[PDB]
Amino acid sequence: ERRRARREIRHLPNLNREQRRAFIRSLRDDPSQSANLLAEAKKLNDAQPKGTENLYFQSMIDPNAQLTTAQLQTYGDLSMMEIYRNYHYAFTQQLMGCWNTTNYGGRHTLDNNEMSRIWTSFYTQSLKNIIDAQYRTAEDAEKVNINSVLRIYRVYLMSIITDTYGDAPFSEAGLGFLEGKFNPKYDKQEDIYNAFFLELEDAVNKIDPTKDKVTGDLIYAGDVTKWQQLANSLRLRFAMRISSVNPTKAQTEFENALAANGGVITDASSDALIKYMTIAFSFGQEAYSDYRGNSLSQLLFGNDPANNPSYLCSTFFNQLYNSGDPRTFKISRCYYDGLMSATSPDNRVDITQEMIEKGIAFSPRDPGAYSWEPWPTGYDSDICAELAVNNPSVTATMAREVEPKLANNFLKSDNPGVVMTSAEVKFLMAEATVKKWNVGSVSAEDLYKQGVRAAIDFLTDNYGCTATTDAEFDAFIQDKGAFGHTDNQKLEAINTQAWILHFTNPAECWANVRRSGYPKLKSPAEYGFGQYLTGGTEIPVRLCYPVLESSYNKKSYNEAIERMGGTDNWHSLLWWDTE
């Protein structure tokens, strides 16, 4: 029955290759559905008469160009990036004060449309296109590289979805075009993570530099050996992610990845960074269909950049400042923005050094706080007094300017899109070593210090920040940057430093904070804003599914929320988030 059905599907004249491969894979995965799958395939065949402009001969965007589009969308999609400014950067307590960040994430405002942005953007565009391109190139010896790269990036995009929402479509995602199935079930997160390891393992073993050239790669320019390092490093990320919920599997998967073909990312020259270019910052209509620039950087600059810049949260600024971290004023500056352009961070007046010379206190925003509440004590700026002689609109008394802001280096359209770094690999190795897994002979303390060093150099290499010297590094690492002398101290140190590193990777930052428990963040209620937390006191640990799904993918959604006790609650812990 199964073999008869496969032959008939191979011989349907009007299916395209990705449709055929999808049906054949579904036959393998679920042989009982042979009769059903065969009938759906015939229906699809009958509906697609010859010479299909009306389908596929149009926007015959090839698999490599889907890779390009998917990489661009990851940080280039201006509608999707709103989720990070609204929610993630507040939940990780790194930014606070901008109206958007304080209102939504800082004060626990449930807003289903704002929460839906990752779901909507990926399942309508890049994850759907990657899945179609993966099936187009599947089981084809002459395309194993583009196929493997697509499989790796499919896993990466899916990891953002499941780490945001929990159970979600994966195995059945994208099957409307491929099989006429528009109502995908939500795979269990545990099964999704199982599939991650299997996919990454297989992709690593199918890559073969003698086969097809990967032409649309904005991360590694087609270097498939680096793609194996990325895949194996992602296995380490996902192995560490499940280390609380399934310690035994976690250790096995972590050790398997270290021994796999290609190795992992051991050095910054194999960092996985999406390349973006310089385009104008616009919030007009046409900008929402241009993914060529980093739109996260655009948003952190702001649609209201003079009055709602990216102010830093006190949790993050004080960690940096009070520890003597050399990145404190690489990541943040105090600026007077009275002469700043409306569309770019030009003509800002850096008052950071003046504040330091005069001993003025920096006033970062507590979780829950707006820039105007509490209103900070300022000071008289000599720099701005001198500016005011030829620029009469300039004031010389600073007020909210003493609230640290994201530095200009992180407000550039050509800022990279961070996927994964060697610094993270070090931190994952350091934590695997503290947990006593078999990961080599290198000590956890040497790996930690290598990670901190890599994370500092990361800002110098990719964002133009001032270098840190060996002596500056040694002063920091030998004092408040030190590793610690208990296991809990060492885990705190490692994951407090990963948190700093992941500032430019908000999806991973939020995942590792929730997974590791570090740093130990307090609810805005503890800072006095508890009366404002309409969506509950505790910092949300996931986001809710779109209302759309509850009405138009009802059976699948109902299955998912019944696994959580019958409700879709953003205080409900994800499967891998355990004590």
Site residues (vs a copy of itself, CB under 8 A): 47-48, 51, 53-55, 57-61, 64-65, 68-69, 72, 119-120, 123-125, 128, 173-174, 176-177, 180, 182-184, 215-218, 275-280, 282-290, 292, 303, 546, 548-549, 551-553
Return the number of the residue (215 or 244) whose C-beta is nearest a copy of itself: 215
- At closest approach, how far in Å is the CB of 275 from a copy of itself? 6
- Within 8 A by CB and 6+ apart from 477, the residues are 449, 452, 453
Shortest separation between residue 512's beta carbon and a copy of itself, angstroms: 28
Question: Residue 168's beta-bridge partner residues?
Answer: 187
Q: Which is nearer to a copy of itself, 210 or 285 (CB)?
A: 285
For the bound state, the minimum distance from the C-beta of residue 184 to a copy of itself, rounded and expressed in Å, comes to 8
**Looking at beta carbons only, is 292 or 453 nearer to a copy of itself?**
292
CB of 395 to a copy of itself, least distance (A): 24
User: Do 542 and 570 contact (CB within 8 A), yes or no?
Assistant: yes
**Shorter beta-carbon distance to a copy of itself: residue 69 or 352:** 69
Closer CB to a copy of itself, residue 103 or residue 303? Answer: 303
Tell me how far, at minimum, the Cβ of 22 lies from a copy of itself, in Å. 13
Nearer to a copy of itself, 113 or 391 (CB): 113
3-state secondary structure of 498: helix
Examine residue 169 and say whether the peptide bond preceding it is cis (omega within 30 degrees of 0): no
Beta bridge partners of 332: 406
When the beta carbons of 215 and 460 are compared against a copy of itself, the nearer one is 215
Minimal distance in Å, beta carbon 54 to a copy of itself? 5
Do 148 and 223 touch, CB atoms closer than 8 A?
no
Q: Check the chain for breaks (C–N over 2.5 Å) and list the residue before each, or none.
A: none
CB of 370 to a copy of itself, least distance (A): 20
Residues in the chain: 579
Do residues 41 and 26 make contact, with C-beta atoms less than 8 angstroms apart? no
Q: Are strands 397-398 and 405-406 parallel, antiparallel or unpaired?
A: unpaired
How near is the Cβ of 454 to a copy of itself at its closest, in Å?
Answer: 26
Spatial contact of 234 and 219, defined as CB atoms under 8 Å apart: no
Between residues 38 and 439, which has the closer beta carbon with respect to a copy of itself?
A: 38
Q: Which is nearer to a copy of itself, 278 or 397 (CB)?
A: 278
In angstroms, the Cα distances linking 63 to 10, 126, 400, 562 are 21, 12, 49, 37
Angstrom distances, CA of residue 83 to CA of 214, 469, 509: 31, 36, 14
At residue 405, what is the residue type? K
In whole angstroms, how close is the CB of 575 to a copy of itself at the nearest point? Answer: 22
Ramachandran angles phi, psi of 182, nearest 5°: -105, 10
Residue at 156: amino acid letter: Y
For tokens 């359209």, the residue is 413
Can you say whether the dihedral through the CA atoms of 529, 532, 537, 540 is positive or negative? negative
